[PDB]
Amino acid sequence: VSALGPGGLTRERAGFEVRDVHPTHYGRVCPIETPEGPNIGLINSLAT
DNA sequence: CTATGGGACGATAAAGGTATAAATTCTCTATAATGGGAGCTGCTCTGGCCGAAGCCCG
């Protein structure tokens, strides 16, 4: 599950709100599986 | 008796003619047609720039 693409946040609009995990991510989006680098937290993976 | 300038020579390349096919641009067609559309929206700050609105003020 990515956040980039059409109608999505660009890496220059990162900030912190999208790139942080929230209690609402529990069991929906994996908290620890994200690519390290320019796009961190923007690209995540669904939970099991 | 010999080397060198002088002049004769001539085979051909350029110059002009001179048409000639290619080729490459130019001009037309007449029912009616009479304001476009993708444009992002989730930076962040700093910095400068005009322009308006209070703020002294004599």
Distance, CA of A47 to CA of A29 (rounded, Å): 5
Whose tokens are 């999208």? That residue is A18
Experimental technique, in short, is cryo-EM
d(CA A37, CA A48): 24
Helix (H, G, I), strand (E, B) or coil at A23: helix
DSSP string covering A13-46: G-TTTTTS--GGGTTTB-SS----SSSSSSB--B
Residue with tokens 């693409």: A5
Q: What is the resolution of this structure in A?
A: 3.3
A35 CA to B50 C1' in angstroms comes to 46
Using CA atoms, how far apart are residues A28 and A34, in angstroms rounded to an integer? 14
* Rounded CA–C1' distance between A26 and B22, in angstroms: 79
Q: Which of the nucleotides in strand B have any atom less than 7 Å away from a protein CB atom?
A: 41-44
Where do runs of H (alpha helix) occur along chain A? none
